[PDB]
Amino acid sequence: ELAKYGLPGVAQLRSRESYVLSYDPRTRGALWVLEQLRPERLRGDGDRSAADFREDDSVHAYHRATNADYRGSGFDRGALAAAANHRWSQRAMDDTFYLSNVAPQVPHLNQNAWNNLERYSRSLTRTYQNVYVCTGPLFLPRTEADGKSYVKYQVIGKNHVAVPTHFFKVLILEAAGGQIELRSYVMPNAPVDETIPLERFLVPIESIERASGLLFVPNILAR
Amino acid sequence: ELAKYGLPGVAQLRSRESYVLSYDPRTRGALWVLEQLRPEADFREDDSVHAYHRATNADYRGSGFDRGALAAAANHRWSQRAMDDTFYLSNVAPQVPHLNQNAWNNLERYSRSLTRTYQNVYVCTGPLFLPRTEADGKSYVKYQVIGKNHVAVPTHFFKVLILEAAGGQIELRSYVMPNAPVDETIPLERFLVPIESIERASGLLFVPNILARAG
Numbered sequence: 001e002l003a004k005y006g007l008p009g010v011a012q013l014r015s016r017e018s019y020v021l022s023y024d025p026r027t028r029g030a031l032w033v034l035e036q037l038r039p040e041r042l043r044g045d046g047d048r049s050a051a052d053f054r055e056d057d058s059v060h061a062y063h064r065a066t067n068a069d070y071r072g073s074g075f076d077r078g079a080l081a082a083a084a085n086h087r088w089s090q091r092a093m094d095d096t097f098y099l100s101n102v103a104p105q106v107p108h109l110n111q112n113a114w115n116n117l118e119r120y121s122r123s124l125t126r127t128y129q130n131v132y133v134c135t136g137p138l139f140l141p142r143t144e145a146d147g148k149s150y151v152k153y154q155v156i157g158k159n160h161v162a163v164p165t166h167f168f169k170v171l172i173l174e175a176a177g178g179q180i181e182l183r184s185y186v187m188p189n190a191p192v193d194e195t196i197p198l199e200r201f202l203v204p205i206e207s208i209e210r211a212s213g214l215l216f217v218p219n220i221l222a223r
Numbered sequence: 224e225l226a227k228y229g230l231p232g233v234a235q236l237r238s239r240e241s242y243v244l245s246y247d248p249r250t251r252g253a254l255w256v257l258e259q260l261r262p263e264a265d266f267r268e269d270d271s272v273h274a275y276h277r278a279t280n281a282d283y284r285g286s287g288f289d290r291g292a293l294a295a296a297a298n299h300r301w302s303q304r305a306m307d308d309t310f311y312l313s314n315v316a317p318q319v320p321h322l323n324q325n326a327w328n329n330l331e332r333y334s335r336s337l338t339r340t341y342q343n344v345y346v347c348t349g350p351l352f353l354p355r356t357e358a359d360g361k362s363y364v365k366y367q368v369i370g371k372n373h374v375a376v377p378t379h380f381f382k383v384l385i386l387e388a389a390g391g392q393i394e395l396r397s398y399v400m401p402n403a404p405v406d407e408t409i410p411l412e413r414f415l416v417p418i419e420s421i422e423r424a425s426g427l428l429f430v431p432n433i434l435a436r437a438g
């Protein structure tokens with residue numbers, strides 16, 4: 001019936017203590033990572049980073065990023081579900097150090113503008129009933145001098161781990177009386193001036209949905 | 224429950240009369256298409272795909288690429304409905320015209336001829352996006368996207384033949400061709416590659432019910 005020998009590839013969801021992700025074996029990185037932030041989550045007893053980055057043995061070795069892929073690349077191991085979101089448990093924080101939760105990030109971005117966006121996201125748990133965060137890579141085309149449009153991204157290491165051109169982050173913010181808002185950001189995988197205000201990187205959710213292949217607003221509007 | 228507001232992206236399988244496929248909404252193209260070759264329309268956009276992520280005829284028009292069907296129309300003469308389903312653009316990738324009409328057409332005809340010889344013939348076809356090293360020493364994936372909807376142009380295509388011989392023995396024959404004007408006098412056997420190289424590059428693991436493959 002064509003399934004006799006099984007199908008050649010299906011969605012790879014991974015549920016960890018601190019997040020759920022969907023994994024793309026072609027790029028060797030997550031398609032998206034989903035977290036729920038709340039205030040009890042952000043205060044410690046996790047907050048030992050005595051965790052090291054670890055390859056994800058639940059991913060077939062053909063399609064698995066390793067620490068050796070990153071070494072000498074010039075890229076940081078940039079965690080999509082952030083370690084500091086998950087001080088509420090050591091297991092929760094350790095799970096953020098799986099390389100399936102990680103993408104090659106320009107070090108300036110990882111340390112400054114993206115870190116600021118992560119801190120801002122946590123600060124909103126003081127305001128909203130619930131804060132959900134969906135984070136992931138983008139591979140965005142550009143028009144080159146021949147007039148044609150191309151996607152171009154570096155791959156690093158023997159395992160050809162894809163370097164995203166950009167990153168997105170979608171915030172779902174729950175306030176009282178059933179209010180639901182969506183705020184969504186894109187930054188380039190590049191040094192980003194840390195003194196640029198974060199709301200300059202707001203984009204409409206439709207542009208992220210079109211570019212990423214994902215759908216956000218139908219699921220949320222369904223409640 | 225983390226997944227309160229659903230999940231932003233799932234596997235997208237589509238069953239048709241003539242094939243099963245898995246659809247990648249980021250590239251706006253199939254990840255793989257699976258069909259059975261048995262001895263015994265115009266192109267339409269696929270309304271089962273969200274419009275944000277759906278290739279259209281306008282995406283191909285004036286692009287210089289042919290609408291290359293992954294499951295080939297000539298595989299599914301056994302039914303009007305089966306052949307019609309090959310003209311959904313979800314079954315289609317941008318193909319260099321010369322490739323579509325000559326060497327990849329010959330590969331498709333050759334695959335059909337194996338139904339003479341084997342008890343069953345299944346075929347898994349799809350795109351590849353293969354990196355290359357540039358003058359700066361670094362390796363890049365680079366591919367054209369065409370149309371308003373940015374339909375990805377594969378750098379290569381793969382075809383895996385799953386050949387069922389006597390005794391239930393399964394033989395795997397794996398081919399890759401560049402998305403380029405391939406010299407059609409080159410014997411098809413020159414495009415054979417080890418299936419592991421396709422699995423590594425594509426993210427796919429073929430025939431996973433075969434826990435221990437032939438030899």
Ligand SMILES: [Mg+2]
Binds near residue numbers: 079
């Ligand atoms: Mg981080």
Ligand SMILES: [Mg+2]
Binds near residue numbers: 291292295296309
């Ligand atoms: Mg056709």
